[PDB]
Amino acid sequence: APVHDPDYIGGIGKELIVDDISDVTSFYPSAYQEHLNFIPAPTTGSGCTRIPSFDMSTTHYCYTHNVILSGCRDHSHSHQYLALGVLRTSATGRVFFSTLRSINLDDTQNRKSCSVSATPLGCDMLCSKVTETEEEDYKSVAPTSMVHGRLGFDGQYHEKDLDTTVLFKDWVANYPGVGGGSFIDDRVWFPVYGGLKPNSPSDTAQEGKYVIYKRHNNTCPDEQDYQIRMAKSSYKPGRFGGKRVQQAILSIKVSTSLGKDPVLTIPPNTITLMGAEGRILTVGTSHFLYQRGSSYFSPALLYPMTVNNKTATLHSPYTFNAFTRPGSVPCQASARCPNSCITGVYTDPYPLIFHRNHTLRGVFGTMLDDEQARLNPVSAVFDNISRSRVTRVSSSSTKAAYTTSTCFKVVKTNKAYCLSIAEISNTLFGEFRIVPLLVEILKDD
């Protein structure tokens, strides 16, 4: 029923800047712009608001984040904030995000790692229902419970538990990838990751599969079969005792029946690195999988994704060598060799500048500009090697964490905007505030 102001409709989910000639990094973000903050901040000293997910279709946006009363990471009950809204314009021509349905989902169930997607029926959610820590989940035999929910245009929420005993038979743990999903054709597509049980069909299918991705102009000096050894062990990090940590994609038919006809796609690990959080993006006619750099590879990754009815295929990724993320040694931001780790942080890149033949040239995102610590969020435009002039939250050292970015255009002014939702350090009210930062994309001629 509700729809964005027509100022935005033709500029959402599109290839924003089509340019074959200009240097990608001649495009750069403006100063942050003041607009209607649609993301609730904590109201107590210990309250934890973390794990944002965001998706926007040409009719509405969907947003969610997790809330824990007593502090973050606490093994405790949690609830989700959920919002459904539309873009509007003031009389002065300034965009604002206008939320229509704004609820807390807080009941007997502990929904974690939730991803959201804007579908024709409202805001679809994929969550894990957890009663164990991740550490414990990798040791129990049963897969993790998972639920497909929807906040409807009427503001009501309904959900259906998936049959994970069947759907995730070959897994010991499984979680949505936190980043948004995408509605494609008649289905909703969500990133998933978790652990495979040893010697299952899915595990055997990945036996001996690996890929080594390299830094630009910065060769790993290690011997080659040593690199191969380390790349293989990177799929089985020591934190969970040698279980293969696997990337997947889950598609669900969009219908008034939730959980209808789900299909799991597991790409070969000759393409994907160790399973991690991620996001399914649709820009123009192209789809991508973002995968968080939780393993040894630091440059931001976008795997081209093509849809084959109910399944997907991924292709060799775009990489953005200056769009690093912090991580612990030996997988810090400047890392160049394969190795085994679980680290990094979710900071996704939004496809922004394209050739006319639709090859991606440049992305926008907010990176944490530090070698090892989650510090100094910086918004910028990135090509395969370089980074534009940047916009920073603070000229002082500042703690931050996850960021997820989405860009859209106002075609009547030909202005490109980028929204960057970032977990930022807070004072007085909890560890984090989740801030929707807004920039305009400018050009330095």
Ligand X SMILES: *[C@@H]1O[C@H](CO)[C@@H](O)[C@H](O)[C@H]1NC(C)=O
> In sequence order, what are the beta bridge partners of 268?
none
Which one, of 273, 281, 268, 350, lies nearest residue 314 by Cα?
Answer: 268
Q: In the block, which residue shows the tokens 């965009």?
A: 95
H helix intervals, 60-158: 134-137
Give the residue with the Cβ less far from ligand X, 20 or 261: 20
Verify binding: residue 257, ligand X, rule CB under 6 A: no
Of residues 199, 285, 308, 357, which one binds ligand X by CB under 6 A? Answer: 357
The whole-angstrom separation of Cα 62 and Cα 288 is 19
Least Å distance, CB 289 to its own copies, is 19
Token pair, residue 306, equals 């093509």
Nearer of residues 355 and 389 to ligand X, judged by Cβ: 355
Dihedral sign of CA atoms 235, 236, 239, 243 in order: positive
130 binds Ca ion (CB under 5 A): no
Q: Exposure pattern of 405-415 as b/e (b: 16+ CB <10 Å)?
A: bbbbbbeeeeb
91, 141 Cβ separation under 8 angstroms: no
CA torsion through residues 123, 54, 286, 278, sign = negative
Answer with the entry of its own copies, Ca ion, ligand X, none that 137 interacts with (C-beta below 5 to 8 A by kind): Ca ion
Residue with CB nearest Ca ion?
Answer: 140
Nearest by Cα to 80 from 103, 97, 46, 56: 103
- Position among 3, 20, 31, 163 found at the interface with ligand X (CB under 6 A): 20
Numbered residues of the known binding site for Ca(2+): 137, 140, 142, 172
Q: Is 359 in the site for ligand X (CB under 6 A)?
A: yes
Residue 359, binding choice from Ca ion, ligand X, its own copies, none, Cβ under 5 to 8 Å by partner class: ligand X
Place of tokens 């007593």: 70
x-or-dash pattern for Ca ion, window 154-173, by CB under 5 A?
Answer: ------------------x-
- Quote the least distance from Cβ 375 to its own copies, whole Å: 14
Q: Which does 156 bind (CB under 5 to 8 A by kind): Ca ion, ligand X, its own copies, none?
A: none
Structure tokens given for 254: 């969009």
Shorter beta-carbon distance to its own copies: residue 106 or 132: 106
Residues at the contact surface with ligand X, assessed by CB under 6 A: 20, 355, 357, 359
Interface residue list for Ca ion (CB under 5 A) = 137, 140, 142, 172
